[PDB]
Amino acid sequence: EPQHNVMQMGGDFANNPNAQQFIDKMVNKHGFDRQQLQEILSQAKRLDSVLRLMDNGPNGAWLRYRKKFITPDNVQNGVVFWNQYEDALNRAWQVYGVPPEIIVGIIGVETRWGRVMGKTRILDALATLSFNYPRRAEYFSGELETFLLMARDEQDDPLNLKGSFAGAMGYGQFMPSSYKQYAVDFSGDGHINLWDPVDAIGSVANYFKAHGWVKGDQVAVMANGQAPGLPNGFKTKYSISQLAAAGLTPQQPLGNHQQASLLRLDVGTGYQYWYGLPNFYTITRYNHSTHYAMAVWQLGQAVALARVQ
Ligand code: NA
Fold this sequence. Notes:
The chain is α+β, with helices and mostly antiparallel strands. It has 14 helices and seven strands. Sodium ion (NA) is lined by residues 185, 187, 189, 191-193, 196, 199.
């Protein structure tokens, strides 16, 4: 019923100005009911761990990162996932131009194909970061808003959904804003479920295309030579000419590519340089990290090979 006079909620966010303004925004902008929203938020928990985690050579650095993902068990499970969802994977390739090895690599690195999807209630993580974390409160408040709208539309109970300490969800660990901007109903059931492997596959593919993935284009090409003078990383940008002058030569032809990022991997015995192409940068659009993108790519290649035999 109404309860117009029950204006103050209990719980961890009871006397929080940010939580109050947020309820006002949801009611005002999306037609949410203040009392219904207060009941939900009165159950939300302020998690210290979420706050602590958000507060964040050659020595073989890449080798250590790589072995976290590329192991016999992971490659074998990757083969099983690929075979199980081969039609969806092929359909995503045809529709979005994103190859199975990239989608398999992303879902493998993110959740080991649905095995590790997160144990934290999304509501708690998002409320905590929205109401008790000034540094990124605006970003997370936006995620919480979208999360509550997602739950309303996919008919989920907001308190039942679990995920990462930052509110990432399902097979591909999509943030609420990614669900909003990039998730698709790939299964064809009329719904968008981040926990449905077919929807997740299509959604990851759409995210990639949206971020500029070029179908059939090379991701990166290993270089012969060393370029210690030049700054490196996925954000760098050099003409092929400058890289050549630096002492590098590509192991594979670079087609019409005239520029590339200079990637450097620490392989213990030394440094391994690569010419980063646009598609490599597109992978970093999922997680801003050279190591992450290289692991996603190589895990997918490893699985593709293991499938052959
Ligand atoms: Na669906």
